[PDB]
Amino acid sequence: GSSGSSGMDMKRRIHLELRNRTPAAVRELVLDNCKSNDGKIEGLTAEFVNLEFLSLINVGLISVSNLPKLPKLKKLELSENRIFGGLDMLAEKLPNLTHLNLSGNKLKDISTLEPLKKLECLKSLDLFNCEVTNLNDYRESVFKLLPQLTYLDGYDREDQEAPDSDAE
Template structure:
């Protein structure tokens, strides 16, 4: 048994308040009488809503969702009443109506009031069988860039995930450019200057220590020389005294000899 849309909504809430929800996926549930039920204006922060294959025939029950950007309605039974989208979801940029019962341009004309619409998908709708279908839609809805996934030059629309990645890459590039423009933090230069100053201070101290050490050695050498001279002088004086005393003794002996001879 298929889950009813209201039950699916309660399940998707996961104990959150409706105003906290930005994305809601209700695919493959069962709508009652082909209408939306369970959605109301309290889902005011909703940006992405998907109701794929829920047997919708009417959008009359769609609440006001002013922040809604993407609306997935593929594989339903919608044949008209698209004017309600401009009234309830004025800021839509992406609308997927593929696999519905849309047959003519007058039905799509109601989307002219969706001024922010950039991408429209009508794949597998009967309207795609019209002659000059793509040219007619691009002329009718001049605000759109992509129809059924391609622009007017047949360039494929970027995937939504790729768009987000590109935006993140752009943000990272901007941050890198700002860092490059700002240059390296001043702290690096200050640290280098401090290191240079510290190095020069150390060299100065080493020079002072070296000079004082050499001067001290020279002073010690001078003292040693003086000590040597002084020691040498004392020995000479002693030798002189000894020689004087020796001569004196010799004279005394000679005098004693002369006295004995007399």
């Protein structure tokens, strides 16, 4: 056996976290830098019924469609990926999602964030280095779209930075 790397597959990186417990025993799961099946998820399963945190950063993903239902997942990190929209699949899979980090994505329009209106629980969002952040008054154009949202790019609805002791 050997440690995970930027050449390891997502199903194989999921196996490296499952070496010690069942997927139903996992609260916090990290799958960063692993390889996807051409921008679709390969190994993730609905047995993660107790998962509250998921990280899939710099895996280079393009589509959220292969996500399982995760009824406890409050926090998802999908940064440094190739995703360009389709976030209505997050609204059905993750019905009480509070934190959604989408930095470095191919998000180009406020209309890519439109299906996040469904998630009445969504409290924090990140869009650092996204094309949608080049728009005129973009930060207000996200908050007017998603009136339930409290944080955008680590700052709040009042344009003040998040606390170090909380914001989790």
